[PDB]
């Protein structure tokens, strides 16, 4: 007997391709596999994962060729086995919701007294449609300081403070995931 699988993460770097990963299983009994089928809400045809390989073990990968028509997906994993066989709950996936980028770029920090912070969008993200609007966040804090100071910078690519330091940016495109922090810039 298996084994009840579960689809536990989906990422897309840019809305143009995306990948879902799942956790098995209980194989033994025999071995197992592991197919992921999906459909669009409202269609009763059931399609198989078009690309098992490029995602990594226990992945499914959706190429540019899917993105550009189908926006949303219902998905299921079928851990068939032997003296047993079994399915996962269905997963609704909307690409918009699982988009996470690359951290924002070349974070320059100037002294201008008072404090100037400019950066650029992440690479990986088009903004020329621009089927993303894109919220940014900053943190700073003296080198040996105890806490971080946060500022949500809403949506343009520059900001201003009033205070030996350390500075990072990150961004999210609602409705999806925050990027990792930009590598820290230092400033005397």
């Amino acid at each position, epitope marked *: 007997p298996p084994g009840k699988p579960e689809i536990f993460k989906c990422r897309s770097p840019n809305k143009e391709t995306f*990948t879902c990963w799942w956790r098995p299983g209980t194989d033994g009994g025999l071995p197992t596999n592991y197919s992921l089928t999906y459909h669009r809400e409202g269609e009763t045809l059931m399609h198989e994962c078009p690309d098992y390989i490029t995602g*990594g*073990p226990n*992945s499914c990968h959706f190429g540019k060729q899917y993105t550009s028509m189908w926006r949303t997906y219902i998905m299921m994993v079928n851990a068939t086995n032997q003296m047993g066989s079994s399915f996962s709950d269905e997963l609704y996936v909307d690409v918009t919701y699982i988009v996470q980028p690359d951290p924002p770029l070349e974070l320059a920090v100037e002294v201008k007294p008072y404090l100037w912070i400019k950066w650029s969008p992440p*690479t990986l993200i088009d903004l020329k449609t621009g089927w993303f609007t894109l919220l940014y966040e900053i943190r700073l804090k003296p080198e040996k300081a105890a806490e971080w100071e946060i500022h949500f910078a809403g949506q343009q690519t520059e900001f201003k403070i009033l205070s030996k330091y350390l500075v990072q940016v990150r961004c999210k495109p609602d409705h999806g995931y925050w990027s*990792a922090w*930009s590598p820290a810039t230092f400033i005397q």
Partner: antibody, heavy 125, light 111 residues
Framework: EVQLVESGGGLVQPGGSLRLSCAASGFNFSSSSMHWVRQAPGQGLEWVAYISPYYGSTSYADSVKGRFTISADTSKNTAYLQMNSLRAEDTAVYYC??????????????????WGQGTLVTVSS | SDIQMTQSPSSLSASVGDRVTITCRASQSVSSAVAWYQQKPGKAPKLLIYSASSLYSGVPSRFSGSRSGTDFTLTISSLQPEDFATYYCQQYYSYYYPFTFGQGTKVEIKR
């Protein structure tokens, strides 16, 4: 079935030039990124560069910045390593390999999971 | 490079059946972006473990990887003759210098 197929290895003058080649297949090239790693005989592995072929974005190991260029032909699924000003210390087996994802977006790779078998580059007169 | 990966010991030998432990210490936090590769000589390295502790497909389950803080350890639970190789760790956390390796660890079988 995945396959990365190296070539262009060979014997070159100190100061000379060489272009390695890695022809890939059976995974989505555009949504992957391609690596070169190298191993001078009897020592450990040294990562050299990768590229994200869709984006054209790249990074280079310091030991090689300024002299080697990585690039890709998306229409043919082939990554290249252009090696200039070769020194003797450049002598090694040169693997190509792939990760899921992109320059600056490695979080979700399951490491470098597919590897060529390497060609050998010898720099000597 | 900006993040260093120190790996010890640089070799060892053990009997068929012993539990065996390689340690890799990152020069700074690297969260969990750690891989482990086996390289049997005159062949290209083979992924064993990714994401600090996930076992790669088709790799035998006597191998396993774990993490505390910035130390990672590949551990072969009961050694086998065909496990003769050099193992390497690798971080892929760095923004500028991802995918750099440790200096590897040679493993020999005592018989």
């Amino acid at each position: 079935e995945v396959q990365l197929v190296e070539s262009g290895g060979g014997l070159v003058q100190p100061g000379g030039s060489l272009r390695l080649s890695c022809a890939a297949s059976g995974f989505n090239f555009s949504s992957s990124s391609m690596h070169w790693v190298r191993q001078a005989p009897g020592q450990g592995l040294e990562w050299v560069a990768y590229i994200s072929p869709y984006y054209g974005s790249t990074s280079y190991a310091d030991s090689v910045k300024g002299r080697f260029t990585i690039s890709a032909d998306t229409s043919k699924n082939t990554a290249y390593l252009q090696m200039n000003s070769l020194r003797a210390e450049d002598t090694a087996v040169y693997y190509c390999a792939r990760s899921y994802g992109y320059v600056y977006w490695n979080a979700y790779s399951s490491g470098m999971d597919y590897w060529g078998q390497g060609t050998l580059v010898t720099v000597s007169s | 490079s900006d993040i260093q990966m120190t790996q010890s010991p640089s070799s060892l030998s053990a009997s068929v059946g012993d539990r065996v432990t390689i340690t890799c210490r990152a020069s700074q936090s690297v969260s969990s972006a750690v891989a482990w590769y086996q390289q049997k000589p005159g062949k290209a390295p083979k992924l064993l473990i990714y994401s600090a502790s996930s076992l790669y497909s088709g790799v035998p389950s006597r191998f396993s990887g774990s993490r505390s803080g910035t130390d990672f350890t590949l551990t072969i639970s009961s050694l086998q003759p065909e496990d003769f190789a050099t193992y390497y760790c690798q971080q892929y956390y760095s923004y500028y210098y991802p995918f750099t390796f440790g200096q590897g660890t040679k493993v020999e079988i005592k018989r």
